[PDB]
Design an enzyme around this catalytic site. Structure first.
Site, PDB file in Angstrom:
ATOM      1  N   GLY A  18       7.792   7.135   5.472  1.00 62.44           N
ATOM      2  CA  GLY A  18       8.045   7.006   6.888  1.00 62.44           C
ATOM      3  C   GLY A  18       9.499   6.991   7.243  1.00 62.44           C
ATOM      4  O   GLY A  18      10.366   7.020   6.371  1.00 62.44           O
ATOM      5  N   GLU A  24      14.889   5.713   6.393  1.00 66.75           N
ATOM      6  CA  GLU A  24      13.819   6.426   5.751  1.00 66.75           C
ATOM      7  C   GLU A  24      13.279   5.496   4.674  1.00 66.75           C
ATOM      8  O   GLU A  24      14.033   4.763   3.994  1.00 66.75           O
ATOM      9  CB  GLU A  24      14.236   7.830   5.239  1.00 66.75           C
ATOM     10  N   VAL A  25      11.959   5.481   4.579  1.00 63.72           N
ATOM     11  CA  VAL A  25      11.257   4.556   3.681  1.00 63.72           C
ATOM     12  C   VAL A  25      10.471   5.381   2.653  1.00 63.72           C
ATOM     13  O   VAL A  25       9.694   6.239   3.004  1.00 63.72           O
ATOM     14  CB  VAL A  25      10.342   3.549   4.464  1.00 63.72           C
ATOM     15  N   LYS A  40      13.525   0.886   1.809  1.00 65.42           N
ATOM     16  CA  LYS A  40      14.086   1.268   3.084  1.00 65.42           C
ATOM     17  C   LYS A  40      15.574   1.558   2.897  1.00 65.42           C
ATOM     18  O   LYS A  40      16.389   0.665   2.554  1.00 65.42           O
ATOM     19  CB  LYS A  40      13.835   0.176   4.120  1.00 65.42           C
ATOM     20  N   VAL A  95       3.132  -1.289   1.422  1.00 68.92           N
ATOM     21  CA  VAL A  95       1.864  -1.271   2.123  1.00 68.92           C
ATOM     22  C   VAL A  95       1.379   0.163   2.137  1.00 68.92           C
ATOM     23  O   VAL A  95       2.035   1.040   2.680  1.00 68.92           O
ATOM     24  CB  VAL A  95       2.009  -1.787   3.561  1.00 68.92           C
ATOM     25  N   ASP A 138      11.198  -8.982  17.301  1.00 65.82           N
ATOM     26  CA  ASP A 138      10.879  -7.567  17.594  1.00 65.82           C
ATOM     27  C   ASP A 138       9.425  -7.209  17.279  1.00 65.82           C
ATOM     28  O   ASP A 138       9.129  -6.243  16.525  1.00 65.82           O
ATOM     29  CB  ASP A 138      11.848  -6.647  16.831  1.00 65.82           C
ATOM     30  N   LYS A 140       6.280  -5.434  17.814  1.00 68.32           N
ATOM     31  CA  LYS A 140       5.978  -4.151  18.410  1.00 68.32           C
ATOM     32  C   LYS A 140       4.978  -3.457  17.532  1.00 68.32           C
ATOM     33  O   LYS A 140       4.837  -3.800  16.374  1.00 68.32           O
ATOM     34  CB  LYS A 140       7.242  -3.288  18.589  1.00 68.32           C
ATOM     35  N   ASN A 143       5.944  -2.433  13.913  1.00 66.97           N
ATOM     36  CA  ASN A 143       6.208  -3.504  12.972  1.00 66.97           C
ATOM     37  C   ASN A 143       4.948  -4.167  12.447  1.00 66.97           C
ATOM     38  O   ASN A 143       5.048  -5.172  11.764  1.00 66.97           O
ATOM     39  CB  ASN A 143       7.182  -4.526  13.604  1.00 66.97           C
TER      40      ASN A 143
END
Ligand SMILES: Nc1ncnc2c1ncn2[C@@H]1O[C@H](COP(=O)(O)OP(=O)(O)OP(O)(O)=S)[C@@H](O)[C@H]1O
EC number: 2.7.11.1
Length: 274
Positions: A18, A24-25, A40, A95, A138, A140, A143
């Protein structure tokens, strides 16, 4: 211009999972400890930009390390030396799954019971955070992840890119934020997973912040069908403008969601349409 294949002679990078506005992960194998992890990294295309490099060091790398089943664990931080310059990173719990932003985009709104369950687990993460002195700040859709085995995982706690769509009225006026600010923002998430839309949209970030301050959300049941008045009540309590009128803790919010999941009346004040 590229992320290397290895970080610190220890993390062998595999596939990319992602990206966001800063990062970028990548899925990686920790060769020291024999663990699949998510790394990350500062985005290659931004990594030489002073403003992004410094933000990465200040923000992303200072994600709080908390130990709870519903919280993405933080394992490590570091910085790799490349011929292009320093590439900072943070190493976290992998994850296998998708964010709520992803899910709402690809599938639209969740069934109300699923939405309840997901947000109820998110409440457990926040309440643990809050008992250890950490305000998320944060909350959202991006997250919160759901795993392949349907576990809820909340990430990136405690950090001082992204959207006013979920900020509390007190953040809209740059004020003190506490547990109740997290409650409001989770309220926004709940609204979106239920309806498919966030409470407030606008041409600009200052326009949406204005609505957080001044404007009542449309009750969920008006925006999408199949949603009960009891669900309006809980959502709109979380979304109350005055912190004193919201759920005072994440635990208190979860308790009302648990009532609704069980077909019991919530304790939140009634909301009447039509
Ligand atoms: N621990 C994780 N395990 C697996 N995938 C992850 C993990 N953390 C992030 N991702 C994926 O990587 C994406 C980007 O991570 P974000 O944290 O949203 O990026 P960011 O650039 O650091 O944050 P902002 O909020 O956009 S500036 C997420 O949307 C997920 O798709």
């Amino acid at each position: 211009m590229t992320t290397p294949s290895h970080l610190s002679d220890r993390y062998e990078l595999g596939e990319i999972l992602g990206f966001g506005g800063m990062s970028e992960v990548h899925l990686a194998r920790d060769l020291r400890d024999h663990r699949d992890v998510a790394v990350k990294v500062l985005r290659a295309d931004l990594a030489r930009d002073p403003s992004f490099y410094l933000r990465f060091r200040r923000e992303a790398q200072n994600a709080a390390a908390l130990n709870h089943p519903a919280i993405v664990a933080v394992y490590d931080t570091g910085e790799a030396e490349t011929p292009a310059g320093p590439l900072p990173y943070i190493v976290m719990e992998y994850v296998d799954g998708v964010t709520l932003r992803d899910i709402v985009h690809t599938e639209g709104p969740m069934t109300p019971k699923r939405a309840i369950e997901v947000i109820a687990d998110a409440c457990q993460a926040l309440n643990f955070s809050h008992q250890n002195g950490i305000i998320h700040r944060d909350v959202k859709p991006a997250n919160i992840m759901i795993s392949a085995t349907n576990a809820v995982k909340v990430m990136d706690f405690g950090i001082a890119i992204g959207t006013a769509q979920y900020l509390s009225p007190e953040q809209a006026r740059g004020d003190s934020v506490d547990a109740r600010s997290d409650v409001y923002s989770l309220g926004c998430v709940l609204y979106e997973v239920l309806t498919g839309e966030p409470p407030f949209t606008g041409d600009s970030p200052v326009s949406v912040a204005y609505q957080h301050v001044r404007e009542d959300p449309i009750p969920p049941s008006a925006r999408h069908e199949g949603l009960s008045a009891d669900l309006d009540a809980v959502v709109l309590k979380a979304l109350a403008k005055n912190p004193e009128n919201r759920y005072q803790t994440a635990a208190e919010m979860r308790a009302d969601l648990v009532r609704v999941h069980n077909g019991e009346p919530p304790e939140a004040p009634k909301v009447l349409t039509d």
